[PDB]
Amino acid sequence: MRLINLDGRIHLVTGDGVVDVAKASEQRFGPDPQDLYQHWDAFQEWARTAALPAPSARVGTIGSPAPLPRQVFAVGLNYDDLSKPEHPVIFTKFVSSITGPVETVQLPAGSVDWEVELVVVMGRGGRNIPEDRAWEFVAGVSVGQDLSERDLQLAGPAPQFSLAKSHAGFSPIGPELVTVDELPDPDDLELGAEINGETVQHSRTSQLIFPVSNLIAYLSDTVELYPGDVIFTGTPSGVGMGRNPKRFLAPGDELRTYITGVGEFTQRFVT
Amino acid sequence: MRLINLDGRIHLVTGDGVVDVAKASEQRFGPDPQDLYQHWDAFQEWARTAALPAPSARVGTIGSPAPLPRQVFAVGLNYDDHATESGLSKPEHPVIFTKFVSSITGPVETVQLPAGSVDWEVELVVVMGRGGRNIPEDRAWEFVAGVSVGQDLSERDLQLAGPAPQFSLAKSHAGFSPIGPELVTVDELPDPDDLELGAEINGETVQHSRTSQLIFPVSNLIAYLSDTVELYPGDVIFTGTPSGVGMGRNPKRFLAPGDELRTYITGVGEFTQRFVTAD
Numbered sequence: 001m002r003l004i005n006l007d008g009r010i011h012l013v014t015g016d017g018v019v020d021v022a023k024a025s026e027q028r029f030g031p032d033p034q035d036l037y038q039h040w041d042a043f044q045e046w047a048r049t050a051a052l053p054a055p056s057a058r059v060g061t062i063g064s065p066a067p068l069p070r071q072v073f074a075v076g077l078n079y080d081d082l083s084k085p086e087h088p089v090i091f092t093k094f095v096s097s098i099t100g101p102v103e104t105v106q107l108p109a110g111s112v113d114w115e116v117e118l119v120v121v122m123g124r125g126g127r128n129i130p131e132d133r134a135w136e137f138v139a140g141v142s143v144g145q146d147l148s149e150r151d152l153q154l155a156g157p158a159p160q161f162s163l164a165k166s167h168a169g170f171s172p173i174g175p176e177l178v179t180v181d182e183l184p185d186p187d188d189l190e191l192g193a194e195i196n197g198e199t200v201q202h203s204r205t206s207q208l209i210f211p212v213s214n215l216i217a218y219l220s221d222t223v224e225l226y227p228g229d230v231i232f233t234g235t236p237s238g239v240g241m242g243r244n245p246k247r248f249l250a251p252g253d254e255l256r257t258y259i260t261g262v263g264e265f266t267q268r269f270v271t
Numbered sequence: 272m273r274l275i276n277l278d279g280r281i282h283l284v285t286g287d288g289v290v291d292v293a294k295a296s297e298q299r300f301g302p303d304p305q306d307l308y309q310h311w312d313a314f315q316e317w318a319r320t321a322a323l324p325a326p327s328a329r330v331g332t333i334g335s336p337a338p339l340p341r342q343v344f345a346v347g348l349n350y351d352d353h354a355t356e357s358g359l360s361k362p363e364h365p366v367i368f369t370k371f372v373s374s375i376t377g378p379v380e381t382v383q384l385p386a387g388s389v390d391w392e393v394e395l396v397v398v399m400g401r402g403g404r405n406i407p408e409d410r411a412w413e414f415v416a417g418v419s420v421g422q423d424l425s426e427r428d429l430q431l432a433g434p435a436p437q438f439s440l441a442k443s444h445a446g447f448s449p450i451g452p453e454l455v456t457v458d459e460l461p462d463p464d465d466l467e468l469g470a471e472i473n474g475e476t477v478q479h480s481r482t483s484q485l486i487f488p489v490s491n492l493i494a495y496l497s498d499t500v501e502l503y504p505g506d507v508i509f510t511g512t513p514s515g516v517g518m519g520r521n522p523k524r525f526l527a528p529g530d531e532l533r534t535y536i537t538g539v540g541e542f543t544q545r546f547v548t549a550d
């Protein structure tokens with residue numbers, strides 16, 4: 001199954017077009033994307049058995065498939081490419097920074113860096129979620145950027161990472177929510193990023209130090225996860241911090257972000 | 272004005288009792304507390320001229336006055352003497368992390384102790400009444416709905432472990448973010464920037480200070496945060512804790528099974544919690 005938020009209304013992707021979920025379900029589900037996750041089990045049963053109308057043209061502004069998660073978990077230092085962290089390093093990206101895959105991103109002053117990430121949206125919640133069943137709790141996955149202003153991120157005593165990753169538009173997610181049954185190997189997805197056509201990140205999520213199932217289980221051993229919660233699962237090497245010379249996003253740069261089998265989007269940066 | 276969340280329904284404090292807002296307002300406001308913050312000015316105008324029913328007795332679970340904030344901002348090292356006792360350098364800008372919303376409760380009678388080193392932190396809690404980006408410092412209190420009492424309970428082992436230690440998860444165990452009992456609006460405070468706060472364990476003071484000792488006062492926090500994020504009505508700010516935390520003592524002391532922790536802000540509220548383990 002694939003879902004897309006168009007002009008604030010959640011749609012099923014059906015064939016080469018879209019089906020408005022609220023209209024098709026006679027207002028039983030939707031239109032608000034975030035409200036679907038609180039009805040997730042009933043929604044999926046409906047979507048997979050109901051007689052859907054013929055699809056409509058895919059038009060409108062693409063929003064985040066999870067625009068208002070109750071909790072946002074973002075992971076640091078989670079790719080292979082020494083001593084590994086013993087447990088996931090966890091911070092947040094504040095929800096006011098979440099957007100769809102919009103055309104442009106404002107560059108604040110500082111050193112703004114790119115991070116392609118697999119985004120996981122929960123479809124079922126709880127505490128102590130068993131790792132070996134964790135994918136059954138996932139509604140689906142999407143493409144994300146964890147845009148990061150490195151000066152604010154790393155400065156001061158015991159630097160806490162969330163605010164520097166929470167500037168306006170620093171958490172784009174989209175274009176589609178892609179359910180697990182669409183992924184050839186949910187635990188081994190190719191992902192990458194290009195700046196002005198030039199590869200700056202390229203890896204596979206098989207390189208996650210803590211895979212998706214482990215992140216879900218681990219988080220749930222401290223917090224209660226909720227349907228609709230969002231996990232930014234971490235980013236591979238190739239960030240501009242790590243380049244020699246060190247390179248950061250500049251006005252005019254075009255950042256293409258992709259995950260194979262999931263989707264892609266491109267954003268331009270302006271000052 | 273004072274508000275209290277009872278069994279999930281927001282109430283207005285009227286004299287010695289309370290009034291259910293949704294019933295009193297004929298469903299125009301409430302019963303969800305966050306609905307009031309989203310429509311704060313309209314709510315306050317209605318309350319100013321409303322004909323309320325007779326007050327009822329406070330009964331039910333006291334919940335957080337802001338039980339489902341869209342964003343939670345938790346501030347580290349925001350009193351100089353707590354900075355000194357942490358072993359870290361004094362900050363030049365607010366240290367910002369979060370306490371995940373699943374950890375927010377009201378002033379519940381008992382808190383489960385996870386394994387580790389669980390530490391106390393009395394804090395002034397701020398609930399936003401108006402949102403925005405680039406809120407000016409000299410207007411910031413006008414964007415505040417009210418204040419309440421909070422604990423930033425902290426499992427210090429997880430908080431400080433591993434490379435690049437990030438504080439949020441250790442402060443987000445079940446029940447680690449109690450807020451309450453009441454929201455108190457700013458006009459009830461003699462000086463909103465100078466409130467006495469403290470904490471006692473088994474009747475012995477372990478924290479006692481005044482929020483006039485904040486390194487970054489409430490107005491500065493709101494201005495600073497809003498220069499990066501959009502604050503929303505109903506958002507929660509844990510403004511930081513004064514000195515006296517257990518990890519700063521010699522020897523270090525942490526909450527133990529059976530400990531009773533009383534947390535207060537004088538003239539605003541208090542609550543007492545007992546700690547128990549899973550055995």
Ligand SMILES: [Zn+2]
Nearest residue numbers: 115146234235
């Ligand atoms: Zn990241």
Ligand SMILES: [Zn+2]
Nearest residue numbers: 392423511512
């Ligand atoms: Zn604190």
